[PDB]
Design a protein around this ligand. Structure first.
Ligand SMILES: O=C(O)[C@@H]1C[C@@H](O)CN1
Length: 266
């Protein structure tokens, strides 16, 4: 393997200030094709772990793949990913959540403004927002294929009071989100901080804070927007399983600290 990757001090500062950071071209075309093929397999065989877009039935997401797929199990331990998660969370880490979110060409939904941590705190018993997500770009992310859109520095407020809607956890994965940020709060945020939709080539990784507000629009391009999202959590920040409400394929219960893939002959 290559000497474990880490972010420069400038990159770390940028991540801390803005709440997100893109590394371009982390994975090459052949690597991304391997991940795309495995994603397709998970969409086909994932069963109850799969979600479909309402009004289309097109497969939208699949969850918990690193528990069921050897490829994705290895991916979360990649020397391209694990060392940076450790660096940013300043701890050993484990995977809280794994999901693949596809927005096909000419498809896609408006994803309501939200903070991930609100879900993890209330649904899963995550005590603090000492977690982040790595979004691997299976496709080039552009202005026009429904990029994750953020309020830069919007995580600095911490967790924001949100409109709650629905019972259970069914609507934690849907177009209509259980925890959504209202018109008023978002106006103030954006007036103060603005909006940014990070772009990048296929194989890029977008790191973003558990508490950063984000949203996305439909894909009006003729090109898909597949993302593999790995949520790393600090081991010290392990969720309180006694307040947990969701299956392990949404919220992990094995808090064993991850170690990196080492090079083998097979
Ligand atoms: O419910 C969850 O855990 C994730 C967090 C947000 O991305 C929305 N769905």
């Amino acid at each position: 393997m290559e000497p474990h990757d880490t972010l420069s001090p400038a990159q770390v500062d940028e991540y801390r200030k803005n709440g997100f950071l893109v590394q371009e071209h982390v994975f090459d075309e052949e690597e991304i094709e391997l991940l795309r093929a495995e994603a397709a397999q998970e969409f086909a065989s994932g069963g109850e772990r799969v979600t479909v877009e309402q009004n289309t039935g097109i497969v939208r997401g699949v969850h918990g793949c690193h528990l069921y797929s050897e490829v994705f199990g290895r991916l979360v331990r990649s020397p391209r990913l694990l060392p940076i998660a450790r660096q940013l969370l300043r701890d050993d880490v484990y995977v809280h959540q794994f999901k693949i979110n596809a927005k096909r060409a000419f498809k896609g939904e408006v994803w309501e403004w939200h903070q991930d941590y609100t879900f993890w705190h209330h649904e899963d018993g995550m005590p603090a927002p000492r977690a982040l997500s790595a979004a691997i770009f299976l496709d080039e992310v552009t202005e026009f294929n429904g990029p994750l859109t953020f309020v830069p520095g919007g995580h600095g407020s911490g967790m924001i009071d949100a409109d709650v809607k629905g019972e259970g956890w069914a609507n934690t994965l849907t177009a209509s989100l259980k925890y959504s940020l209202d018109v008023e709060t978002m106006r103030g945020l954006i007036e103060r901080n603005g909006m940014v939709a990070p772009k990048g080539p296929r194989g890029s990784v977008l790191w973003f804070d558990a508490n950063i507000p984000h949203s996305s629009v439909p894909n009006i391009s003729p090109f898909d927007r597949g993302l593999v999202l790995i949520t790393y959590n600090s081991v010290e920040n392990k969720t309180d399983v006694t307040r947990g409400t969701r299956p392990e394929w949404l919220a992990a219960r094995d808090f064993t600290p991850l170690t990196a893939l080492q090079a083998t002959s097979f």
